[PDB]
């Protein structure tokens, strides 16, 4: 009422991984943008 770190750590690890997964949807990896509506909404099919 005033220690559950082993239970807190497995929650934290899973959330830290799920956030890293979503934060990767905003990297270019060597492209002109991160949005498909910007490569498409401004680029030919080739």
């Amino acid at each position: 009422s005033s220690a559950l770190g082993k239970l807190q750590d497995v929650v934290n690890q899973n959330a830290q991984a799920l956030n890293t997964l979503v934060k990767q949807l905003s990297s270019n990896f060597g492209a002109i943008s991160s949005v498909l509506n910007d490569i498409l909404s401004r680029l030919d099919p080739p």
């Binding site: 002109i32 909404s41 401004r42 680029l43 030919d44």
Partner: protein
């Protein structure tokens, strides 16, 4: 026109730009578009041309 070593620089601004009258004028010997293919110009908006 202007020399090649002191080119001009006009800052087109808030307006209604119709790149179709350009694209289809057939008077141009060279019309290359790099960031964006030409036909999709009349469907996008920027900050400054």
């Amino acid at each position: 026109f202007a020399s090649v070593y002191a080119w001009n620089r006009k800052r087109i601004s808030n307006c209604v730009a119709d790149y179709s009258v350009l694209y289809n004028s057939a008077s141009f010997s060279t019309f290359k578009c790099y960031g964006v293919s030409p036909t999709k110009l009349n469907d996008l908006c920027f900050t400054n041309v």
